[PDB]
């Protein structure tokens, strides 16, 4: 099943960060989801109950990224994919990449950041 | 077979969208079209008869994102999934991926959207 | 006096337009924001009280852009030239430029807006 | 007097050109208009009848765009800048650019076109 | 073994196409070519005999870009895997995908196009 | 008079450079050209000998750019503008601007060059 | 005389900004340097000797971005005005532009800065 | 496991490069590293020892990148991967492409380079 439903470079102004010095200054996070569904049914019917909404998603994201400073951005992604995961029973599995395309590194690149999958249990 | 033809960020206005707004004012889709096809007869030939012609997959991928609006992404991926494998034998599958740059949604993001992948049978 | 202290890109998601849809689906407002500032003073001293904080003129757009939905552009750079001109004497001008990347206009287009300049008296 | 409305970046498929190579296959054509207009009237009252409506502007823009075939992009230009001053009186000046970024020249460049400025009399 | 050589965006007018207006006027065409060569040896000796030079490849795609006219992009992306994986046995494996941003397609998008994958036997 | 002619970011490669080792590579020249030009007679007539035909411009400024390798941008782009002056009564000023986005410089930045306007004599 | 050298989007990592926080961890800054130069007589000539050679120039931009923390922007921009048309007698004023494309304001922007032009006396 | 932390575009300026010109002028190399990781106890603790820290990692990177001119792009990516795999046990594979966007080759393209995988062992 190749499916997907996705949402790309959401763009969140957050505090974490593992330096001091992050969190009283903040930068942005981006985020980009993909989400593993089957979209057959949908399709078929056109009715929006029979997949999942996208707003939902983004506004689930977003309390997460705008929410409590953390640490890593593993942390966070950990809690965007169990959210999500949590919610939705159609998700088959999540996978969340964020990126920060300023850190506190000393040098010319486009970003870093980390990206992980998790299947829905 | 690893072989494709591909028709990229093809932009259409339409009106589809769950949301009576979104039917009122519309807004801009944005498609990428990628085709399993084996093309080593085209290859060896040089017949445009011996593949499938990207123009006239731009015909019905238009038809279908100009046309009659309706409420799922998912709904006018599989039409134009279906119409496409209907048409081209050549076609052993057809993936349609559907973006809404700017969707009713309060935020700051590239894009939501989503992905199918559809075999000819 | 060729001196400036400028805005670029600030992206706003609000409700403003003369129709009734896009009040209710809104949108993202690009704004571009030009100061006429003497900056030398600034320059010799590096004290900040001798210039414009950028930042305080950010929050001075936020709050015009993301508050009460208004129907014209024009209305909301007139708001945001105004407020700045007033909080800041230091500003002999003040240039705004809002675009509308997505308005309900059936077309390719890489979007619309107007521009204006208000001298500061 | 230095506001303005503008509509940058429009993209229509015609059919000008004075090789009748071009007229038979046709190309995208890249239009941006700048509108001289006093906008403090409407700045402070929000009327969009204070105005002139960049709606109708694309409207005139994509009627000389996507009608009849004309050679030169100059005579293009020339007939919107004209019907732009026409039917609005509060356009005090009409800028018209019009970009070929793919016209039949053996080369790598990023487009090619004219400019004009025409004052509304 | 997952070791690739590639050439990204490579540019040439041609004069390619079915179509008689499209042999006369030409267009770009855009190049990607990915080689799968197994990198170690080179890795460790250094040594740019051990390893394919890109600049040769670059100027076998030109030669058959830039050459003689065909009909179809399968029959140009199928010389140059042909001709690249003929004169190099390190090569397990080419990947040839061509582009036309500018097809005589009546419409908005980035690009049509084909891809390749063709292994050295 | 504010019409004009342009061609933006022609590209060629070329071996200019005060150093020895520049000669010898080569790297890519940008070039932007703008023709001051009253386009109002070929807007009214629609005929192209009422007008410098790009095509005939490009075919000059290659012809300086991809010829005899000298050492300054300075020199190219007076070759090219007193060539365009000299061959064309119509453009009465023309501007040339070079931009080296790869010299020999150790650093990061978008490029570096000279833009020089002459008027026609 | 309307002739330029430039360089553009030059940028470097360092720690300047009125914010303890911003000299700690520190980002980067981008910057735009156009040098008034009348450029005829190297046009001429094609000495390098006739003009001013961009390479020296990033090299003092860049000891200044790249050297003791400041405050403002206003001061770095100064500096190196004022550094540039020391060194320099062909340089008839000197503008430069620095952008924070990512300073500690909560927010979707593309970048703030200052801009200043300085006469060489 | 598809968890990978990543770096994306960092640039260097080296002297890298066969051809003896190369080692003189130098050039920007184009780095991306992506590394294996399974990020999962991070994700749970957000303690930043429970993963691999990017800054350290572009710091490994940059000393390669900014070292010793070699010869290949094979060598230079052979010696990050085996500098990586070898600090860090918790990176189960190291992916390192390497890009010469613009290299002594007379043409038009993107940039050309290589990419290879690394299992640690
Ligand atoms: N892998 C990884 N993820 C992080 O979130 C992270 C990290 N590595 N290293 C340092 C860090 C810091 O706390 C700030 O970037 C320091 O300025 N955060
Ligand atoms: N997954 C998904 N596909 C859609 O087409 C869709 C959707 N989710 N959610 C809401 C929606 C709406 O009808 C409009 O976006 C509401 O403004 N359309
Ligand atoms: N010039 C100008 N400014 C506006 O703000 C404006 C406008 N013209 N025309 C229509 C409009 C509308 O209320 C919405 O775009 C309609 O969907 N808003
Ligand atoms: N200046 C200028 N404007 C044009 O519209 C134009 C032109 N110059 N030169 C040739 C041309 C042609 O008819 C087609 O480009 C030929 O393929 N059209
Ligand atoms: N698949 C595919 N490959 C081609 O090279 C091709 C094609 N399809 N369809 C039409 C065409 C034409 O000869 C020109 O595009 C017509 O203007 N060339
Ligand atoms: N202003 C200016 N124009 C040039 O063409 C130029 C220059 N300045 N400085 C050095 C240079 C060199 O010969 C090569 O860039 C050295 O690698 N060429
Ligand atoms: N106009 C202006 N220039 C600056 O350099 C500047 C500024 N305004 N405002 C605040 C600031 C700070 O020290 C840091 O941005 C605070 O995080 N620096
Ligand atoms: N595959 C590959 N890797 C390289 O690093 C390389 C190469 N091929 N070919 C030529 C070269 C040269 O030494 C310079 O590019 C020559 O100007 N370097």
Redesign the interface.
């Known amino acids: 099943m190749?499916?997907?439903?996705?949402?790309?470079?959401?763009?969140?102004?957050g505090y974490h960060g593992?330096?001091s010095?992050?969190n009283?200054?903040?930068?942005?996070f981006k985020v980009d989801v993909t989400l593993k569904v089957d979209?057959?049914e949908?399709?078929?019917?056109?009715?929006?109950i029979?997949?999942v909404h996208?707003?939902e998603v983004?506004e689930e994201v977003?309390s997460i990224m705008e929410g409590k400073a953390?640490?890593?951005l593993?942390?966070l992604?950990?809690?965007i994919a169990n959210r999500i995961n949590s919610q939705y029973n159609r998700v088959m599995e999540t996978?969340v990449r964020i990126t920060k395309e300023?850190?506190?590194?000393?040098?010319?690149?486009?970003?870093?950041?980390?990206?992980?999958?998790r299947e829905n249990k």
């Open positions: 190749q499916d997907t439903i996705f949402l790309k470079g959401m763009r969140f102004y593992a330096l010095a992050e009283e200054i903040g930068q942005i979209l057959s949908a399709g078929r019917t056109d009715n929006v029979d997949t996208y707003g983004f977003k953390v640490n890593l593993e942390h992604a950990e809690r996978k300023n850190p506190p590194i000393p040098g010319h690149y486009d970003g870093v950041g980390i990206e992980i999958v």
